[PDB]
Amino acid sequence: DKWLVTEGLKAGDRVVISGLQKVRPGVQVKAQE
Amino acid sequence: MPNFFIDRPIFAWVIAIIIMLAGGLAILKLPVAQYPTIAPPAVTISASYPGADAKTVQDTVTQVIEQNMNGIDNLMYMSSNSDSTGTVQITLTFESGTDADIAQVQVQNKLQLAMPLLPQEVQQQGVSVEKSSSSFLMVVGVINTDGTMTQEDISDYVAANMKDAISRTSGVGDVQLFGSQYAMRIWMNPNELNKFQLTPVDVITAIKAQNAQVAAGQLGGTPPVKGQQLNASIIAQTRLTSTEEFGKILLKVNQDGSRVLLRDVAKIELGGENYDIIAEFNGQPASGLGIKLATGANALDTAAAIRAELAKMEPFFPSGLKIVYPYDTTPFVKISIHEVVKTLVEAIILVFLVMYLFLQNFRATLIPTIAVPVVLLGTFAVLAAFGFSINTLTMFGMVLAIGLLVDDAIVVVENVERVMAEEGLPPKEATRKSMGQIQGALVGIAMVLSAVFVPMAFFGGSTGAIYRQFSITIVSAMALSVLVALILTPALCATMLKPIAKGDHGEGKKGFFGWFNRMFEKSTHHYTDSVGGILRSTGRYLVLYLIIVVGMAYLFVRLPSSFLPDEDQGVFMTMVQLPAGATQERTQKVLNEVTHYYLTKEKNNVESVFAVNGFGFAGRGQNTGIAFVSLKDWADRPGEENKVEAITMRATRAFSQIKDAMVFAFNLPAIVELGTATGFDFELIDQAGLGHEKLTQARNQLLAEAAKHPDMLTSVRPNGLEDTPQFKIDIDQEKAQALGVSINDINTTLGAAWGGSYVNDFIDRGRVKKVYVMSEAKYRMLPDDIGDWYVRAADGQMVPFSAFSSSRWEYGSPRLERYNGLPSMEILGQAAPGKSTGEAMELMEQLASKLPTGVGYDWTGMSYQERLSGNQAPSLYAISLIVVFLCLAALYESWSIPFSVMLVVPLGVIGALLAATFRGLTNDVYFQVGLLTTIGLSAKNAILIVEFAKDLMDKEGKGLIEATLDAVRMRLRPILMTSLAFILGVMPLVISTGAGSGAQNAVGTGVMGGMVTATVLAIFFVPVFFVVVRRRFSRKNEDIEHSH
Amino acid sequence: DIAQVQVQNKLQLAMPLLPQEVQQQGVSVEKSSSSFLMVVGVINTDGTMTQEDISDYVAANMKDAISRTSGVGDVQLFGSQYAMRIWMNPNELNKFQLTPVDVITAIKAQNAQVAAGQLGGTPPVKGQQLNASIIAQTRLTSTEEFGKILLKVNQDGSRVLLRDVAKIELGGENYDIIAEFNGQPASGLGIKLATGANALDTAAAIRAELAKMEPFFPSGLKIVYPYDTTPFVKISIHEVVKTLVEAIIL
Amino acid sequence: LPTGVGYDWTGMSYQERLSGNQAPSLYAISLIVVFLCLAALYESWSIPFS
Amino acid sequence: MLELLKSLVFAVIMVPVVMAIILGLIYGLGEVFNIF
């Protein structure tokens, strides 16, 4: 269900996955994982 | 004529009787709905080209049809949607009153030309031509109370045993399914193919040749030989009734004759033709049928016609099925109307008391009582012969007519008693001179008031019909009241009144009645006692009038102007939208959290929810969701908080806390198009064929510029859908054909597998249903799966895609549009509140003007009509000033005396503004129409007061003051009989809460203040206007008594 | 319309009596007027375009809306819409041993628009994250593109192309028609009033429709109004109301 | 009849069903209107019976 | 049955009042203009 991505991301990166409405770029956000 | 029926009352009553009979057979037979239909007709066509993107759809179908669409009348515009569902909807908007049937004709007669052109995938998936509203009439849910039927279980039974019917029944513009029909689904395993070395095609034709309806003919058919003793048709391969017959389909015989079957290569199972949709009814598996009312057809009669087809079906329901009616728009219509019936009745009663408090006798009070219904009843037939129906406003013309109707009798009736008060003549004779002196003004007054209510029925555009409802019914009963006042009432005064002695005002009476008449006369005498001193100074009050009129000029302008109240409908919808590429699971998940909200955080107010996945107004596809909710009756929803207005907001606020979901709850306005003050409908267009991506960067250019004026723009949004990564195979052709594989088979093996495909028909239980082949989901889930698909080349060797296939990510739009045959990016926003419509639109157009080369743009819908030449109203009211005056100076045969009359208009205009402006209400339809009511009355007294005082100075020799006084005091009592009778008439509505209470309060209050300030302010102010203009434009020895 | 209906009704009877392509070609019934309301002409005055250049920009950017216009019951083009002209050299086919069949049959391959469905579409497997629209072959918008349509290849792949025999270029659907205007190359529209309309009004929305189009006209593109009936009926009515006035005085 | 068995009347039965309801309601209308008029001619709530 | 007996009283009880209202208006107001 996931993408392997050869590049551009690193370990420990918290993926902002959902919330595609409440998140426009740059907006502050409270993570959930 | 009164003298005629005075001698012929039975011949009179028989007239009133008759008017009650026709009206009776009128009332039975008229249509009912909430409103006149102002909805402009349009036609929809809808395509299915399964498995496709919107792009493919658009190009091989949409524009195809577009290039055919021409030379058809009353086209306003055409809108179109292509989508990756493989779907089309092309809407063509036609001028109102344009013929629905024809439009469907003329369009489809074009359409058939493109048909042979359209992809066969289109032709068998079929197309549809719908004349219907963009909105559903009612939702009807279905479930298994026993849970013995799953959704598809419920889906199909609806489909075959129900759907066609509601789709046949007249009045239904469309039957939308929530569910799917069963199909014979064929689920492919490539590795079984290649292990058996085959292609989907291999599966397919075999279905055809081996799913067959054939006609061997008949043994001994015609023509025969001579002597043939035997005749029979021949019976050959039959359409398949079941899976098993499919699985035993022969992919081929072999050289040895070895079978290769289907059930080895595939899963055969029943299923919904498309699975795109799911609903549940308050949280369990369900299906149902979205209903859209036939354009021009009548809901209430449509709806009930729907509930007959169902009830017919109920006996034959299998175990557990139950009909549930999550959404029905009809019941608010019916209920809020008969609340006009109660009021009309209850108001009828209220007359009888007021008349009684005055008359203090049984029979007498009947006389004003029986005239009211006859004319109200008499006006229904008018609706019929003019070809009207029943509705909100017309039913409101009924009440607003009473105020006129009831004033007529009283004035007629009171007059007859005064002649008996004054002269002691018996009623039978007392009627005649009473009638004789009033018979001229009753008539002429009917011509003036008409000049008030006639001008409104010419209102331009859509609104034209709205206000037009009243003027006809209102001028209907106005005509009628007179005729009855000339015919019925007099014979009622002759027969049904007490004679009275000369000089008896009721004083000798013992009890509250005497005490009552004993106070009234002392409230009158002191009352005149002012209008005496009031006219000892004419001037001081002229300034007191300047004050008021400016106050009137202060509020009316300050009072906001709007269109029609949105009434709580006790039913609503939450639209959900999810980003593209979203799996139905990502939508399904939302639904619960949305539903879940309706099942708890609102319980009491919530009766039910029937919610969906994959559908909404979109169209189809998984990232959309909608919820039909049932609220219990208003009776279960007390307080402003428990209404839909309130409820929605909480929801709107709450859902906001969710991730991934353009969601909002809404409750639809009085009309889709009709807007008192909302947002707009705008179009970016591609004139140069610039291309979508150029538009988005043109559109996003507009929004980004748009969004910079919140003080003007607000909520500016694209209606549609951003691009999404796609899976794009680029076939190396030479390789393939270097391999000897055939493209179509490649393509074929693709769309059918990854997009599904429709083979042919079959039967389920005597019923036709559709065949489908497609990849077992697990195989079609993902990109790599392509290389699982192997192909027979010229050499028989089964060849993968991945060798001749190469694929990539990239964008395409999930959804696509055009408008009137050009690419359109629709955009929705609204005026920054405190900004009035055009101001937003100006800045829109302005913001559009700077856009890159070759960019066009357009407006439609609300903004379409917006170009309307409104503002014909002021021109007409101005006109209506002129008829009124002239008619006075006609009735009065003087250019001056009309002026003493017309000065009263601001006194009732002021009163309504106040109360409405006290309560929080608006300047609107209901408010305007009642002022004209407050006018017509408040003008009617200022008319009659003037008729009297003048005839006094004209017929008798009373001097001015002595004449003016006699007019009003003689006229004091009738007025209070009209006003108070009328005041209470409208009381139920000012107290009204619940269904219909929105219109009503506006009706009542805007009436309440008007008549109040009509009543007491005027009767002071009229005597002054007579005398003042009387004096100013005076002449000769006039003033002091010159008699005779 | 009613007329249109009974006709439409009987006509249905004879469609099965039609040879197929007529049916496939389709049979239209249209309220007709054999006299165009007007004609609006066009040119490029910097010459930067040809009569075909003008021919097509019309049909595409204008006619249908001109067609959809209120009061327009029929339009007739003077011009033609571009449609790809593939020019078959027989001797170069035989040179390559090929046939128009060879040159057609493949056209259906390249210039194909295919429906591929989706990744993980419905009915899906649960837990599915991604759903996407597969994109299969698409239409070929340009000369270069058809040319690279592939008649065939060899097992080695040697490429026998559409253009691998004859040329290819755009051109009008037919070269049948030509208009000049004052001897200047021209393309134009036959313009018929739909039966029933006020033509004073139609034409104005027609002009209106043009004031709409003009901003988007290419450079040197020009409209001309070679034929119109309105200017007459304008003065006629005037000429009449003139008589009204004097009649009043005399 | 057995389960799954419906019926429909139709044709002259379909019509004979709907236009039967209409007969009496008209006679009364046809009775009412008739009495009224004479009473107008006669000014009598009885003589019309004669 | 009690629906109407519910409104019937009130509907009657207010009649004198609102009439009593306005007779007092013309009482108080008729005092306004002789004053004014």
Side-chain angles (χ1 to χ4, degrees), chain A, chain B residues 1-537 539-671 673 675-865 867-870 873-1034 1038-1040 1042-1044, chain C, chain D, chain E:
Chain A
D1 63 350
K2 297 180 177 74
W3 286 95
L4 172 58
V5 177
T6 54
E7 72 291 9
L9 294 176
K10 277 68 181 181
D13 304 345
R14 299 180 189 176
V15 184
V16 174
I17 304 186
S18 61
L20 286 180
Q21 289 67 357
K22 56 181 63 177
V23 168
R24 291 177 180 171
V27 181
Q28 292 174 337
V29 166
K30 283 69 180 183
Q32 289 184 336
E33 298 184 350
Chain B
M1 293 183 66
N3 294 283
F4 179 85
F5 301 83
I6 289 172
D7 291 339
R8 299 178 177 280
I10 295 171
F11 182 80
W13 291 90
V14 173
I15 296 174
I17 297 171
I18 292 163
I19 297 167
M20 293 188 295
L21 295 174
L25 299 171
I27 287 175
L28 295 174
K29 299 300 179 57
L30 275 69
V32 185
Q34 189 170 3
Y35 294 135
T37 304
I38 295 167
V43 171
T44 296
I45 300 166
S46 299
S48 175
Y49 176 73
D53 69 17
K55 185 182 175 55
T56 292
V57 172
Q58 183 175 357
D59 298 346
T60 52
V61 175
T62 308
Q63 298 183 336
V64 179
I65 301 163
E66 294 183 343
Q67 295 177 348
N68 293 277
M69 299 296 97
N70 54 32
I72 296 170
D73 292 342
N74 300 140
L75 170 66
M76 288 194 283
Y77 60 89
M78 164 182 72
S79 67
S80 66
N81 289 344
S82 294
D83 64 8
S84 293
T85 66
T87 305
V88 174
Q89 292 180 331
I90 290 177
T91 305
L92 277 67
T93 309
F94 302 162
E95 296 294 336
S96 176
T98 302
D99 185 350
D101 297 341
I102 301 306
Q104 184 169 358
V105 178
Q106 300 172 329
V107 175
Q108 187 177 350
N109 198 26
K110 302 298 187 175
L111 180 64
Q112 61 184 21
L113 280 66
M115 291 297 300
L117 298 171
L118 295 169
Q120 190 68 64
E121 296 87 0
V122 180
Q123 299 179 336
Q124 289 178 336
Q125 294 304 328
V127 180
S128 62
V129 174
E130 295 81 349
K131 64 179 182 295
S132 66
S133 297
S134 63
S135 63
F136 297 90
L137 182 58
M138 74 195 75
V139 182
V140 182
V142 180
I143 67 175
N144 180 320
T145 61
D146 300 346
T148 58
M149 290 175 72
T150 66
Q151 192 165 0
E152 297 76 354
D153 297 343
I154 295 180
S155 306
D156 184 71
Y157 176 86
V158 179
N161 295 272
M162 306 180 63
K163 179 169 178 293
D164 303 344
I166 306 303
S167 302
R168 289 197 294 277
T169 298
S170 178
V172 176
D174 182 75
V175 174
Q176 180 54 63
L177 173 58
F178 300 96
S180 179
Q181 183 172 357
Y182 290 156
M184 182 56 76
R185 296 285 296 167
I186 298 173
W187 290 96
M188 299 182 280
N189 183 341
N191 296 331
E192 293 307 319
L193 294 174
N194 178 33
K195 181 185 178 180
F196 293 95
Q197 290 88 359
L198 302 174
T199 67
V201 173
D202 301 338
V203 177
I204 288 153
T205 299
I207 295 164
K208 296 182 178 174
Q210 289 185 332
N211 184 21
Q213 194 60 261
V214 203
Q218 27 153 232
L219 261 68
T222 62
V225 296
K226 181 182 179 176
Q228 185 60 58
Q229 293 296 326
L230 177 67
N231 193 28
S233 298
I234 301 170
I235 299 303
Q237 289 172 336
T238 64
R239 297 297 185 191
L240 271 64
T241 62
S242 61
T243 68
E244 180 178 359
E245 296 177 351
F246 294 93
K248 68 179 177 177
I249 291 164
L250 180 58
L251 296 175
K252 61 181 181 178
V253 176
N254 297 285
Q255 185 170 350
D256 73 5
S258 67
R259 293 177 296 187
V260 181
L261 298 169
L262 178 60
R263 57 179 183 174
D264 288 345
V265 296
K267 289 176 188 175
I268 299 164
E269 63 180 348
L270 275 60
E273 299 170 352
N274 67 24
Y275 299 125
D276 290 342
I277 298 169
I278 292 172
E280 293 174 352
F281 179 76
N282 281 336
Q284 66 188 19
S287 169
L289 300 172
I291 296 170
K292 291 175 177 307
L293 174 61
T295 304
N298 182 342
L300 299 177
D301 292 341
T302 296
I306 294 169
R307 298 171 175 275
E309 188 60 18
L310 303 164
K312 290 161 59 185
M313 297 176 175
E314 300 179 346
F316 298 85
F317 288 174
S319 66
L321 295 180
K322 180 176 176 66
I323 296 167
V324 298
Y325 295 107
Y327 178 77
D328 181 2
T329 63
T330 54
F332 174 81
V333 179
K334 181 177 181 179
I335 298 167
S336 61
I337 300 297
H338 304 284
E339 291 306 325
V340 178
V341 175
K342 294 161 63 176
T343 58
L344 290 167
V345 176
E346 289 177 344
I348 285 163
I349 300 167
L350 296 176
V351 178
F352 180 79
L353 292 172
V354 173
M355 299 297 93
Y356 176 74
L357 175 58
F358 293 105
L359 297 173
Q360 299 166 341
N361 184 37
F362 178 84
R363 291 182 293 104
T365 57
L366 281 66
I367 297 171
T369 303
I370 298 171
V372 168
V374 176
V375 170
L376 293 177
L377 297 171
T379 304
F380 295 79
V382 180
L383 299 173
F386 296 164
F388 293 172
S389 64
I390 293 179
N391 64 33
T392 301
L393 304 173
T394 57
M395 293 299 293
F396 295 164
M398 294 298 163
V399 183
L400 297 178
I402 293 166
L404 293 170
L405 301 182
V406 68
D407 187 67
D408 294 345
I410 295 166
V411 170
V412 173
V413 174
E414 185 280 336
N415 186 357
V416 180
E417 293 300 327
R418 179 182 62 80
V419 177
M420 301 191 286
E422 295 184 349
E423 299 179 352
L425 294 171
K428 186 181 175 185
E429 296 93 355
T431 300
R432 293 181 178 84
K433 179 180 184 180
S434 171
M435 295 302 302
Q437 60 180 21
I438 62 186
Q439 184 167 356
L442 296 173
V443 172
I445 289 163
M447 298 296 100
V448 176
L449 274 67
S450 64
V452 169
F453 299 98
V454 177
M456 74 177 82
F458 296 99
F459 283 169
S462 278
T463 303
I466 300 172
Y467 297 91
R468 184 169 294 115
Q469 297 303 325
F470 292 98
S471 177
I472 304 301
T473 304
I474 293 179
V475 178
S476 306
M478 284 200 286
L480 295 178
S481 190
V482 177
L483 279 66
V484 171
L486 275 64
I487 293 172
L488 182 65
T489 300
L492 272 66
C493 295
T495 64
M496 292 182 71
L497 297 172
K498 289 194 296 192
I500 294 170
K502 183 179 174 179
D504 182 14
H505 295 84
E507 286 181 350
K509 289 180 184 170
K510 177 64 174 170
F512 178 83
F513 296 170
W515 182 93
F516 176 79
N517 289 347
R518 290 284 291 174
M519 64 176 288
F520 179 75
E521 300 299 328
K522 180 63 175 173
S523 175
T524 292
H525 185 61
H526 176 77
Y527 169 77
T528 60
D529 291 345
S530 294
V531 179
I534 287 169
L535 302 170
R536 295 178 66 183
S537 61
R540 297 175 70 178
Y541 304 123
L542 277 66
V543 173
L544 178 65
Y545 177 67
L546 292 171
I547 300 301
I548 292 169
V549 179
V550 176
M552 172 177 69
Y554 178 73
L555 293 168
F556 174 73
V557 58
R558 292 175 58 84
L559 181 66
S561 65
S562 63
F563 181 71
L564 290 180
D566 295 349
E567 299 288 321
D568 176 2
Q569 295 177 343
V571 296
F572 59 87
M573 295 179 285
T574 308
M575 177 176 175
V576 171
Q577 184 61 258
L578 275 61
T583 61
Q584 188 170 357
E585 182 175 1
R586 293 175 76 254
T587 292
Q588 180 62 77
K589 182 171 173 292
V590 179
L591 296 173
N592 290 333
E593 294 175 349
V594 172
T595 297
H596 185 277
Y597 176 74
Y598 293 91
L599 293 173
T600 61
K601 293 183 173 69
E602 298 296 324
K603 293 177 181 179
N604 298 336
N605 299 346
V606 176
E607 176 57 12
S608 76
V609 174
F610 175 79
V612 176
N613 193 338
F615 176 80
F617 299 100
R620 296 180 296 102
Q622 297 179 321
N623 57 343
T624 186
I626 185 166
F628 294 99
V629 176
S630 186
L631 298 173
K632 293 175 183 295
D633 183 69
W634 295 267
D636 286 340
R637 297 182 286 96
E640 187 175 4
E641 70 284 7
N642 291 343
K643 302 294 183 289
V644 175
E645 182 180 3
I647 294 156
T648 306
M649 180 175 64
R650 296 191 294 275
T652 306
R653 186 179 61 259
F655 299 159
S656 64
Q657 290 182 336
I658 305 163
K659 287 180 295 299
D660 299 334
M662 196 32 207
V663 180
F664 57 88
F666 59 89
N667 185 29
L668 293 168
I671 301 166
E673 180 67 6
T676 341
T678 164
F680 54 80
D681 184 351
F682 177 80
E683 296 302 326
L684 173 67
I685 304 298
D686 182 0
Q687 300 298 326
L690 295 173
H692 180 67
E693 297 88 355
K694 299 296 183 64
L695 299 164
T696 301
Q697 299 169 347
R699 173 182 72 196
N700 291 339
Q701 183 171 1
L702 177 60
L703 301 170
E705 294 307 325
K708 295 174 181 179
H709 296 79
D711 55 357
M712 185 64 75
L713 281 59
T714 299
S715 300
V716 177
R717 294 187 286 106
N719 196 345
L721 299 166
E722 301 298 323
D723 285 345
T724 61
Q726 70 195 29
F727 180 77
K728 169 73 178 170
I729 296 170
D730 281 348
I731 303 302
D732 178 74
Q733 302 293 319
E734 185 186 2
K735 179 62 171 170
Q737 292 181 340
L739 302 167
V741 287
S742 62
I743 303 306
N744 298 339
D745 292 344
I746 296 165
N747 297 329
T748 301
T749 295
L750 173 64
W754 289 85
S757 67
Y758 172 74
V759 176
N760 59 349
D761 290 338
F762 64 93
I763 304 298
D764 177 70
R765 295 194 296 271
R767 176 60 170 163
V768 183
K769 290 181 185 175
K770 288 187 173 69
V771 179
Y772 295 96
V773 295
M774 185 165 172
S775 175
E776 189 181 355
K778 63 184 289 183
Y779 295 145
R780 56 192 195 78
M781 296 301 93
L782 298 170
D784 286 344
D785 294 343
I786 302 302
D788 284 345
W789 290 104
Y790 305 137
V791 169
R792 189 176 60 261
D795 59 0
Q797 294 181 338
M798 304 297 292
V799 173
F801 299 163
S802 55
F804 63 83
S805 79
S806 64
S807 60
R808 72 180 174 283
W809 286 105
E810 56 187 351
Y811 291 161
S813 182
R815 179 180 184 274
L816 292 171
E817 295 177 349
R818 293 170 67 76
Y819 175 85
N820 290 332
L822 287 183
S824 64
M825 289 180 170
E826 176 180 1
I827 301 166
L828 294 173
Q830 61 175 13
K835 300 298 184 181
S836 63
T837 298
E839 294 183 352
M841 301 182 71
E842 299 178 358
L843 183 55
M844 293 306 290
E845 303 172 345
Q846 293 175 334
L847 287 175
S849 59
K850 304 302 292 180
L851 292 168
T853 301
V855 178
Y857 68 72
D858 191 4
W859 296 91
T860 194
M862 298 187 289
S863 299
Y864 175 81
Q865 186 67 251
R867 265 168 263 250
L868 312 160
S869 311
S875 182
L876 297 167
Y877 296 135
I879 294 169
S880 181
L881 295 174
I882 293 169
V883 180
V884 172
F885 175 82
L886 297 179
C887 296
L888 292 176
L891 172 63
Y892 294 91
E893 184 62 17
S894 178
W895 292 87
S896 60
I897 300 172
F899 291 106
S900 60
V901 171
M902 297 175 66
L903 293 178
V904 294
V905 173
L907 304 183
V909 177
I910 188 69
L913 293 169
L914 287 169
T917 297
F918 290 160
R919 179 65 177 81
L921 275 69
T922 179
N923 188 340
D924 64 353
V925 171
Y926 295 134
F927 181 83
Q928 294 174 337
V929 301
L931 293 177
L932 301 179
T933 303
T934 303
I935 294 167
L937 296 174
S938 66
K940 189 178 175 183
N941 292 332
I943 285 168
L944 290 172
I945 294 170
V946 178
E947 184 60 10
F948 280 170
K950 180 177 173 291
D951 292 345
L952 288 179
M953 312 166 73
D954 291 0
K955 296 180 172 293
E956 292 178 347
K958 301 298 183 178
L960 177 60
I961 304 303
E962 187 173 0
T964 298
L965 294 171
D966 288 342
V968 63
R969 179 175 72 86
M970 293 170 61
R971 177 58 76 182
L972 184 148
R973 181 180 177 271
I975 301 169
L976 300 179
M977 298 181 78
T978 295
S979 295
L980 294 177
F982 178 76
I983 291 168
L984 295 165
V986 300
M987 178 174 288
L989 304 166
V990 174
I991 59 171
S992 175
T993 59
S997 58
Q1000 299 176 331
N1001 287 330
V1003 172
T1005 188
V1007 177
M1008 180 168 176
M1011 295 302 297
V1012 174
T1013 63
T1015 293
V1016 301
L1017 275 64
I1019 60 164
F1020 296 106
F1021 299 166
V1022 172
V1024 171
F1025 297 154
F1026 181 66
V1027 300
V1028 163
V1029 171
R1030 179 61 178 160
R1031 290 177 179 288
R1032 178 64 181 86
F1033 295 166
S1034 181
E1038 177 272 336
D1039 55 11
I1040 292 171
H1042 58 287
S1043 306
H1044 58 72
Chain C
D1 295 348
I2 300 303
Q4 184 172 350
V5 175
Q6 298 169 322
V7 173
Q8 189 176 351
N9 282 336
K10 298 294 180 57
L11 177 63
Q12 187 185 13
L13 303 172
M15 295 301 295
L17 301 170
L18 295 181
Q20 189 67 57
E21 77 288 14
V22 183
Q23 304 174 321
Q24 301 294 100
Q25 292 301 107
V27 180
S28 64
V29 187
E30 181 180 356
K31 301 189 290 182
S32 76
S33 61
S34 63
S35 61
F36 299 97
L37 174 54
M38 77 190 77
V39 178
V40 181
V42 184
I43 66 176
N44 186 343
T45 54
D46 65 24
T48 47
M49 285 171 72
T50 61
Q51 192 170 357
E52 299 307 326
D53 298 344
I54 293 168
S55 301
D56 182 68
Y57 173 85
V58 171
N61 290 279
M62 303 173 70
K63 181 165 177 290
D64 287 353
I66 303 305
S67 85
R68 293 198 291 280
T69 305
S70 176
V72 177
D74 174 69
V75 173
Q76 182 57 68
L77 175 68
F78 300 157
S80 179
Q81 196 163 0
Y82 292 150
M84 185 72 67
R85 296 289 297 173
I86 305 176
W87 294 99
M88 294 184 287
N89 180 325
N91 289 344
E92 291 181 347
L93 272 69
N94 174 43
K95 182 188 77 178
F96 292 168
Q97 294 181 337
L98 305 168
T99 64
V101 179
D102 296 339
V103 181
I104 297 158
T105 306
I107 290 170
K108 295 187 108 31
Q110 254 90 67
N111 230 10
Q113 191 62 63
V114 180
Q118 296 179 336
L119 285 173
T122 53
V125 176
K126 304 301 293 180
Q128 184 67 54
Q129 294 298 324
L130 173 66
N131 187 34
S133 300
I134 305 170
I135 307 303
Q137 288 181 346
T138 62
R139 296 301 175 191
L140 291 175
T141 68
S142 66
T143 59
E144 297 87 350
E145 296 169 353
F146 296 164
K148 63 172 185 188
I149 292 169
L150 187 57
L151 299 168
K152 58 180 190 180
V153 293
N154 295 267
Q155 301 295 324
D156 66 18
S158 62
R159 297 173 74 247
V160 176
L161 297 174
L162 177 61
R163 73 192 173 174
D164 270 4
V165 276
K167 334 195 169 146
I168 302 177
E169 61 192 343
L170 300 178
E173 300 167 348
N174 61 45
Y175 295 143
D176 291 337
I177 291 173
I178 297 176
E180 291 176 350
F181 178 79
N182 290 337
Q184 191 170 358
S187 178
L189 293 179
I191 300 168
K192 294 179 176 177
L193 184 65
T195 298
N198 183 340
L200 291 175
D201 295 338
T202 299
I206 294 176
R207 299 182 176 279
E209 181 62 17
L210 298 180
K212 293 186 179 171
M213 296 173 162
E214 291 175 350
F216 302 86
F217 289 176
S219 298
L221 175 55
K222 180 177 177 181
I223 308 302
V224 295
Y225 294 79
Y227 173 73
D228 179 4
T229 62
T230 53
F232 175 81
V233 181
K234 293 179 181 177
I235 191 65
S236 65
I237 295 173
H238 175 74
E239 298 304 318
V240 178
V241 176
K242 186 173 177 290
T243 297
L244 296 175
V245 179
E246 303 170 5
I248 299 159
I249 300 166
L250 299 169
Chain D
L1 300 171
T3 303
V5 174
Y7 61 87
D8 195 5
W9 292 96
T10 189
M12 72 188 91
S13 300
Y14 173 89
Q15 294 294 316
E16 184 281 340
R17 184 182 64 194
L18 279 63
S19 293
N21 184 344
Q22 186 178 357
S25 183
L26 190 67
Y27 293 136
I29 296 171
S30 181
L31 178 63
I32 292 169
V33 178
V34 171
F35 175 82
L36 278 57
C37 292
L38 276 64
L41 183 66
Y42 292 142
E43 181 77 17
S44 177
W45 291 93
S46 65
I47 293 170
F49 294 99
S50 64
Chain E
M1 66 198 78
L2 297 173
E3 180 177 3
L4 298 179
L5 178 62
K6 176 61 158 56
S7 65
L8 180 62
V9 290
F10 301 159
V12 179
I13 299 303
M14 299 295 290
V15 178
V17 181
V18 62
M19 176 184 283
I21 296 174
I22 65 98
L23 285 183
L25 272 70
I26 63 175
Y27 175 78
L29 304 176
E31 288 172 349
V32 173
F33 301 159
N34 293 346
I35 283 172
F36 179 83

